[PDB]
Write a protein that binds this ligand. Structure first.
Ligand SMILES: [Mg+2]
Ligand SMILES: [Mg+2]
Ligand SMILES: [Mg+2]
Ligand SMILES: [Mg+2]
Lengths: 222, 196, 125, 222, 195, 233, 212, 204, 195, 196
């Protein structure tokens, strides 16, 4: 019988700073045990300082991104070139996803950018449209490997102040763009070691008030 | 079923057995599987008898309506109409049809349309359950530009073997000759072909 | 379906079909409504050219829409039944979804909306 | 897994990758897939990992006892026959797929064994998830009358094809060369083309970071 | 939704319905009234699939109330029961049927007689002296066959009903948290607050 | 919901310095029966694009008709149909990709794997894949079916990344393709010896080669192979 | 998930957890399971995240349209019924929702309605919904009285979620508290179970099963 | 009805400089219901340590079985079993039940008393040995543990530093798994002293 | 067979077991004692598959009694619990396993301490301060987490137990017909006749 | 697989292709499907390779033990041992074996043993998936008492067609000649047989 879904593998990662945000993703595309492409981007600049990735079944992912990009275009036409805020984009994507509630887009969606106060923002979605703003989110095949590492390093979970008898927690603070990229690169190299669907290349999109910048790094190709 | 169509020097000949089965019971031992969709465009039917009769009737209607407006249709056109029906309704059909026809320009032509609804133009074609047993024989013995008598012997010997090995095939061997001369029906009985 | 725009504007900015509908109301028997301190009273005229009537079974001029709201009218009698039926259906629909009977203002707003819809819909007067 | 076997002039060579999987997760990044049945008879296994190890050890034990009993050096056909009759008896429930290779007084030999008990002969063979990538290389470059150095190259090239193109295979290349008249040479990590790059950061914690409730000395002595 | 009983006596119809609403391994409520007043002298109890029961009961209620206003007249219990039956008869051959069983207890003012109708989700209607839906009948019917008399008073009908509830509370596996009892007679519908 | 009946096997392709190469055998299988032997599975669109198709042949013929009709439609009211407003590989691919995804979304797919090879108007090489699920991807080498498992590894040894493309000539690239087709003939049970090969170059244009055969095959070593284990004779 | 809401002398307490799970994978520990419909209306979420989040925000839009059209805040009954009638239309399609519509109005007073995806709609004083509902019930029922103070009521609702967060594997993260009065709803903060548990254990002397 | 994920739990083992560490959570549940927060999954036979995840009845049964076998080993051999030897014994015993296996994920840890070499090993349910220099992971949060260990681990850590690494690897892995947590224990093993520490973690 | 509870307090172990035996839609009995005395200071309650429960309980009882006679000595609760666990551990990989869950409440005379062991049909053993089998735990565990203290008296343990039964009687779907309570202490095993 | 055995004037010849498939993948393209169970008693194997190898090995053991006690076995005896294994274990076997052997008394003989474990002595036999396509060709072209060269051409042409149409068949054509002279192995490559 015809199965309309597939798994194209790969993994994505979004982190929010004080005045910036990053959305990273590996460039490997796979089916079963074969490599389809060593460089197939899945993190996209959608305009209005919003970056987006829909990881999972790539056909559904490409369709969703394509539809959201189109939603931004029409938002400009219908509302006098108004800038689509990240929160408004998030709600819009919920309706796109939930519109196919009974035949879902098989993807974990993450968007990143700046909120209306200029502060770093990341929003994450389940396949059917439930969403939440977070400082930190990993998605895709290696999400289970990366996410607990982020809890420990970004949000300082299970880390107490030395000598305080485990009474005083390690204080939360915003990380620099340099420190965030270090955590991203270390997350992906670790994922590449322990996950077969992750590798080849790492593409990071960084969002600041100045615009969207790109950075590429090699990953192991085995 | 054992059906085949073979092009030759003067035109094309369609050949078929006459057995129709319901399981192991022979419902009809004198079936006519060679069916006219136009004067000199005929077809050999295999698969679901209900599906292939329904299709052939619709095609005959289309080609009659075509002729009234645009004149005599080409064999390629007839094959195109068969394909359109078989391809678009592939989920609800079990039909394996060989289309054969004679033009004055294009001479003898043969098109085969398998289950999926694809079209394949060929010098000769074989189909039906009994065809499996004669792929080897037909490939070794078929020549292009054969005479009428040679083509009749080829079809007779071929279907004789298909009938011999296929339980779903048997009875008489019917043949239809399509040339510039006209349309000729031939029949061959067991006592002749069995002892070839 | 019959699509004709029957209710349309005239050069002077009037919708004659709506204004001629008011003339039908002016022809109808008189109806009066007076509200007191703790009550409302609905008075209705019945023309006396009709004798040998059966007042038991003849449709009453005042109609209950729900147990707490009533509707009287002036104009075409047959037309009034269509509004009354729609109003009664809406009253029960309101109780079903809101779990509370209609306010008098709400019921009026519904009936008025139905009347308005028939002034800019095709194929209806 | 990618495994290969190649015959040459005066012997035979086998090779394998060093990735051990657990679904899409890489459990062991440097496992040894080349096993010893007898000193000059080696075995490469794919399929169910416990079965390949257990079956190669059992036949290896019985081969040793047989060699002692007969006062003769073990033959590859004996290991082949003992393996296939054992596997056939269990009707494929022992998921062992092997490439067997070695030298004995009769000469040099190369066989493949499948879980249901069927055997094959050949001059070049490949098994595992990366067998098609490896065989593509073998079909491109194999020729009659190979030298030892040509065979090792071909074999390791075939494994590399699987390492790079098959997600089930990775890390390093192990080789074993069995030449007639000589001792067999096991070349552990003959190639190491997948070295983990230096991490961007050290995650050594300050001492006292972890909150503790109770400490106690454990008695391991009598 | 589980236990609904009905007893028609001399001058009234008594409906008894369980108070429990259970979902999974939790009794979510123990005071649920599984009935709707269709008209002043007609009461309908119900049981079956969650959601469908109340949705159906309220739909019927609205239709009967609509009829009452339109004609300024109360439909007879027989007329209401036939309307309800037809709706269930339509429902069973729909895309998604109402899985709801009902008892309709009413007092016919023209005949001066109590009437009890049992209707299942298929649209199977029967007029009975006493009725039940679900597993309840397997205990109560035999008990009522023995103790029931046609000329009983309302008080005698309540004592008979107490005997049914006691038997159910003894032998039924599930805790249905007692019953709400309602009486339908010439004077209308009233609830027995202490049972 | 479909099932493929008459099928075509691997389509293989790669980029080289000035353009792209694509190849596919001339077989139309009917399950295990090698039914049809004269099936062209490379279909040129204009003088700058070649679409290579595998999977169900009836759906392939449907796609041929769509492409044929696309050229006709593009020529309507278009004075620059053979110049600036001619069909590009990227236009042809996106059209097919839209169709493939729409059909899977209606649970009625075209049971195919497609590779669109071509050269854009600015000279850029175009090579992209689409299949029955609407899944799309691009790579210096692309292949379908068995080709993905056996051809890609061989082709990736020539062009392992983007920077290897300018270093690869048409002679070297074609040799790797022809070698890959031989390997597939050895190891794919639903393949044939006869195949077609197409080269789309930015300078020399579209070169379409028909009736090619797999040659220089190694079979001699088979004579020495005896038995399945112990048998000596 | 564990959600509760109960009625008492001083109005309504509403308490929920913040854990989200996909199988045994803990997807999130910081999910908002209370929706703020308006200053006098709250909605709780259990079952499918998307179904609850989408349709209860949709519910707020419908409640807003009501007060525009009727120049009056919607009743808790009417609000709950819009949601229950909506999900009933989808019955059989596979929606998974266990919700509680809580609020105050003049005519009704403090009111709680339980609404779920198979069409059930129930008015009640006490409800617990979710995989950890039984654990919350155990603590809530044994300590519940109508004459509870606002302080003790808030704590009981918090303590009930904590109990469920501890025992139920698919409940945890943090506790979100809400109090609803005649004047509207009041937020009483986010309480991380990581710190809350040890604080409650020490101060209360409870949770002796755990290695202290 | 998946034997490996009914009771829940995790074990992790790491090597350091002249030392090894093995750690586990304390949870035992019945699917969603947490039943016990005192269920230790690490045992020792002489100086060889064994952690076992998976079906709790099999955890208990195998402990009793290896206690049985190592006691007889000691009486006959007149010496304590070594980690390398015990690893082979665990493998043999698991594979003996090839077509009716114990639903477990065992982990061996210890220091060889003769050579002084730190040793760890892991197994699948039918005994396939996973030997590793760096670390071994097992249980319902194995994916989480692989991720934590791969990033946090570095070679030649001192006992005091190794404790912090293994503790943080376990805790943060457990907090992303519903069926793991509810307390934790960490064994730090040196050549001739062993320290056992109970960790403070979130109890949900 | 449904509800079995256990609470270990300062100087005793208290087992509470439901009296209902239900088959189909009928409560066949409301006074069933779901326990067997294994030895003078060891008591085992049980629940699970019909037939298996009693058959298993009596088989264990016979074996422990056989041991008592042979050695003229009472086995410790820990020793009995281990024996029981092993039998269940054997059973789960048999042709037809015992589908029986047990609680073992005993007073160790050598240690002068009460002990409560929870063992399921798989052979999963745990020593606990309080325990339960089936759906009971989903209500009682959270209640006991809150109210339980380790230094409680027997009387305080009974009041705590009453609180559990009340919660079960309120929120459980099925009527389990109350519980039989038994206390295991230094002086042996006795039953609380009024609960 | 495509296998056949043909009796002729001087004895018997066994023929076979060399392709072994796992689905559509060719696991071995140079398989030897012609296997010795005794000096001048050989067999062609089709079906499960594990089952047919196991069977052939057991038969070889039985015939070696037979020879030690009772002298050279007849081809009929060898066929009987195959049958006994195939028939008694029919529920757990998928084996289609053709037995062929040369006696000095009985000359060349051929026995075929299909799936069920029945035995059929024949002048020639064909088996395997590719045999279906050459029932017609073989029936028309087989003659009794052919010469060695004629029998080689018959097998070569026959298997060539089987290979041409059957995807599961291919590679080289192996043949084993059994006569009084001795045992001769023959091989024929694609470049020769494909263009017949
Ligand atoms: Mg990788
Ligand atoms: Mg956890
Ligand atoms: Mg929890
Ligand atoms: Mg072939």
């Amino acid at each position: 019988q015809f199965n309309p879904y597939g798994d194209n593998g790969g993994t994505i990662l979004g982190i929010a700073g004080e005045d910036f945000a990053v959305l990273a993703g590996d460039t490997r595309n796979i089916t079963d045990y074969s490599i389809n492409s060593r460089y197939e981007p899945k993190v996209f600049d959608c305009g209005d300082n919003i970056v987006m990735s829909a990881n999972g079944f790539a056909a559904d992912g490409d369709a969703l991104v394509k539809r959201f990009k189109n939603s931004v275009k029409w938002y400009h036409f219908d509302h006098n070139d108004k800038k689509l805020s990240i929160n408004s984009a998030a709600r819009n994507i919920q309706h796109l996803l939930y519109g196919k509630r009974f035949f879902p887009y098989y993807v974990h969606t993450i968007i990143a950018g700046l909120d209306e106060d200029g502060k770093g923002a990341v929003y994450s979605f389940d396949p059917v449209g439930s969403y939440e703003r977070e400082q930190c989110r990993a998605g895709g095949a290696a999400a289970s490997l990366i996410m607990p590492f982020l809890d420990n390093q970004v949000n300082f979970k299970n880390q107490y102040e030395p000598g305080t008898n485990g009474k005083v927690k390690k204080p939360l603070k915003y990380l620099s763009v340099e420190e965030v990229i270090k955590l991203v690169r270390d997350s992906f190299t670790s994922a590449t070691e322990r996950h077969i669907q992750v590798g080849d290349g790492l593409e990071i999109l960084i969002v600041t008030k100045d615009g969207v910048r790109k950075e590429f790094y090699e990953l192991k190709r085995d | 079923t054992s059906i085949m169509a073979v092009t030759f020097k003067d035109g094309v000949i369609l050949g078929a057995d006459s057995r129709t089965t319901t399981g192991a019971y022979i419902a009809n031992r004198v079936t006519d599987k060679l069916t006219r969709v136009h004067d000199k465009i005929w077809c050999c039917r295999s698969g679901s008898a209900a599906d292939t009769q329904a299709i052939a009737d619709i095609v005959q209607y289309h080609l009659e309506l075509y002729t009234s407006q645009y004149g005599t249709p080409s064999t390629e056109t007839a094959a195109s109409v068969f394909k359109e029906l078989c391809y678009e309704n592939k989920d609800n059909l079990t039909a394996g049809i060989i289309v054969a026809g004679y033009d004055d320009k294009n001479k003898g032509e043969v098109y085969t349309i398998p289950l999926g609804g694809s079209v394949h133009k060929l010098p000769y074609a074989i189909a039906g359950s009994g065809s499996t047993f004669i792929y080897g024989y037909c490939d070794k013995n078929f020549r292009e530009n054969m005479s009428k008598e040679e083509t009749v012997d080829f079809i007779k010997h071929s279907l004789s073997q298909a009938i011999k090995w296929d339980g779903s095939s048997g009875g008489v061997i019917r043949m239809v000759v399509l040339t510039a001369a006209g349309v000729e029906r031939l029949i061959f009985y067991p006592d002749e072909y069995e002892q070839l | 379906g019959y699509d004709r725009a029957l209710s349309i504007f005239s050069p002077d900015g009037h919708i004659f079909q709506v204004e001629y509908a008011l003339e039908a109301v002016k022809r109808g028997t008189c109806a009066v409504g007076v509200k007191g301190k703790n009550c409302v009273v609905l008075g209705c005229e019945r023309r006396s050219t009709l004798k040998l009537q059966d007042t038991r079974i003849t449709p009453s001029k005042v109609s209950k829409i729900d147990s707490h709201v009533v509707l009287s009218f002036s104009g075409l009698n047959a037309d009034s039944r269509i509004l009354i039926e729609k109003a009664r259906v809406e009253a029960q629909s309101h109780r079903l979804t809101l779990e509370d009977p209609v306010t008098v203002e709400y019921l009026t707003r519904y009936v008025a909306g139905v009347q308005q819809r028939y002034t800019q819909s095709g194929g209806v007067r | 897994t990618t495994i290969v076997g190649v015959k040459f002039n005066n012997g035979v060579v086998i090779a394998a990758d060093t990735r051990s999987t657990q679904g899409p997760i890489v459990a062991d990044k440097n496992c040894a897939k080349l096993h010893r049945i007898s000193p000059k008879i080696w075995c490469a296994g794919a399929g169910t990992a416990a079965d390949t190890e257990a079956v190669t050890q059992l036949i290896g034990s019985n081969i040793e006892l047989h060699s002692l009993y007969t006062s003769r050096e073990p033959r590859v056909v004996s290991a082949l026959q003992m393996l296939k009759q054992h596997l056939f008896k269990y009707q494929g429930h022992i998921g062992a797929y092997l490439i067997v290779a070695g030298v004995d007084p009769t000469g040099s030999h190369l066989f493949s064994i499948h879980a249901h008990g069927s055997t094959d002969v050949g001059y070049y063979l490949s098994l595992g998830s990366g067998s098609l990538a490896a065989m593509a290389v073998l079909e491109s470059h194999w020729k009659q009358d190979l030298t030892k150095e040509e065979a090792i190259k071909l074999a390791s090239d075939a494994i590399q094809a699987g390492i790079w193109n098959d997600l089930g295979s990775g890390s390093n290349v192990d080789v074993c060369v069995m030449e007639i008249g000589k001792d067999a040479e096991y070349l552990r990590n003959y190639l190491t083309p997948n070295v983990r790059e230096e991490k961007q950061k050290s995650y050594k914690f300050p001492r006292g970071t972890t909150a503790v409730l109770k400490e106690s000395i454990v008695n391991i002595c009598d | 939704m589980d236990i609904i009983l009905g007893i028609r006596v001399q001058d009234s119809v008594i409906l008894a319905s369980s108070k429990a609403v259970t979902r999974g391994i939790s009794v979510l409520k123990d005071s649920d009234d599984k009935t709707r007043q269709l008209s002043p002298h007609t009461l309908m109890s119900f049981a079956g699939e969650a959601g469908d029961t109340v949705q159906f009961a309220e739909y019927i209620q609205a239709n009967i109330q609509l009829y009452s206003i339109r004609e300024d007249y109360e439909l007879s219990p027989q007329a209401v029961s036939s309307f309800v039956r037809q709706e269930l008869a339509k429902s069973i051959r729909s895309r998604r049927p109402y899985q709801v069983n009902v008892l309709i207890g009413g007092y016919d003012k023209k005949k001066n007689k109590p009437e009890l109708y049992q209707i299942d989700y298929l649209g199977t209607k029967v007029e009975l002296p006493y009725g039940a839906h679900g597993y309840s009948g397997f205990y109560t019917f035999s008990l009522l066959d023995h103790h029931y008399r046609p000329d009983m008073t309302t008080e005698e009908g309540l004592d008979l009903l107490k005997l049914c509830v006691q038997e159910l509370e003894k032998r039924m596996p599930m805790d249905f948290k007692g019953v709400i009892v309602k009486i339908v007679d010439k004077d209308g519908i009233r609830q027995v607050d202490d049972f | 919901t479909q099932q493929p009946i008459v099928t075509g096997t691997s389509v293989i392709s790669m980029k080289y310095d000035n353009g792209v190469i694509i190849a596919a055998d001339n077989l139309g299988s009917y399950g295990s029966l090698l039914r049809f032997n004269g099936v062209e599975r490379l279909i040129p669109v204009g003088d700058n694009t070649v679409v290579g198709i595998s999977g169900d042949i009836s759906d392939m013929q449907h796609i041929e008709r769509l492409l044929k009709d696309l050229v006709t439609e593009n020529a309507y009211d278009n004075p620059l149909a053979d110049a600036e407003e001619a069909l590009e590989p990227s236009y042809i691919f996106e059209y097919l990709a839209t169709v493939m995804y729409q059909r899977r979304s209606k649970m009625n797919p075209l049971w195919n794997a497609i590779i669109v090879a071509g050269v854009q108007s600015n000279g850029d090489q175009f090579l992209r894949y689409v299949n029955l699920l609407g899944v799309t991807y691009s790579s210096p080498t692309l292949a379908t079916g068995f080709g993905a498992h056996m051809a890609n590894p061989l082709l990736r040894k020539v062009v392992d990344r983007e920077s290897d493309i300018p270093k690869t000539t048409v002679q070297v690239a074609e040799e790797a393709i022809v070698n890959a087709m031989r390997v597939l003939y050895y190891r794919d049970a639903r393949s044939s010896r006869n195949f077609s090969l197409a080269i789309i170059d930015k300078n020399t244009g579209l070169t379409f080669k028909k009736n090619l055969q797999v040659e220089n095959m190694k079979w001699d070593f088979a004579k020495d192979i005896k038995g399945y284990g112990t048998q000596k004779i | 998930t564990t959600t509760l809401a109960f009625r008492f002398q001083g109005g309504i307490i509403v308490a929920v957890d913040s854990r989200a799970t996909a199988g045994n994978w803990v997807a999130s520990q910081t999910v908002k399971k209370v929706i703020e419909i308006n200053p006098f209306l709250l909605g709780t979420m259990a079952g499918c995240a998307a179904d609850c989040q989408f349709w209860e925000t949709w519910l707020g839009s419908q409640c807003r349209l009501h007060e525009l059209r009727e120049k009056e805040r919607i009743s808790v009954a009417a609000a709950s019924k819009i949601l229950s009638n909506l999900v009933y239309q989808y019955k059989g399609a596979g929606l998974s929702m266990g919700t509680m519509i809580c609020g105050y109005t003049r005519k009704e007073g403090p009111t709680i309605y339980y609404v779920d995806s198979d069409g059930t709609r129930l008015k009640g004083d006490i409800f617990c919904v979710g995989s950890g509902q039984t654990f919350a019930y155990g603590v809530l029922d044994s300590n519940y009285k109508w004459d509870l103070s606002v302080e003790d009521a808030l704590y009981l609702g918090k303590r009930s979620i904590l109990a469920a967060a501890h025992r139920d594997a698919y409940s945890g993260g943090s506790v979100n508290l809400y109090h609803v009065t005649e004047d509207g709803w009041i937020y009483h903060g986010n309480h991380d179970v990581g710190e809350l548990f040890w604080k409650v254990k020490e101060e209360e002397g409870s949770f002796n099963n755990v290695i202290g | 009805s998946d034997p490996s994920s009914i009771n829940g739990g995790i074990v992790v083992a790491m090597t350091g400089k002249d030392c090894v560490a093995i750690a586990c959570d304390l949870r035992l549940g019945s699917q969603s219901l947490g039943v016990s927060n005192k269920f230790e999954k690490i045992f020792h036979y002489g100086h060889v340590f064994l952690g076992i995840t998976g079906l709790a009845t099999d955890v208990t049964t195998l402990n009793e079985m290896f206690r049985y076998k190592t006691n007889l080993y000691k009486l006959k051999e007149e010496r304590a079993i070594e980690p390398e030897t015990f690893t082979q014994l665990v493998s043999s015993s698991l594979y003996e039940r090839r077509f009716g296996p114990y639903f477990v994920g065992p982990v061996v840890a210890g220091i060889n008393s003769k050579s002084g070499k730190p040793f760890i090993a892991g197994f699948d349910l039918i005994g396939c040995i996973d030997e590793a220099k760096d670390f071994i992971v097992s249980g319902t949060a194995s994916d989480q543990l692989f991720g934590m260990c791969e990033s946090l681990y570095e070679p030649n850590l001192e006992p005091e530093d190794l404790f912090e690494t293994i503790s943080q690897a376990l805790l943060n892995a457990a907090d992303r798994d519903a069926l793991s947590g509810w307390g934790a224990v960490v064994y730090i093993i040196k050549k001739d002293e062993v320290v056992k520490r109970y960790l403070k973690m979130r109890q949900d």
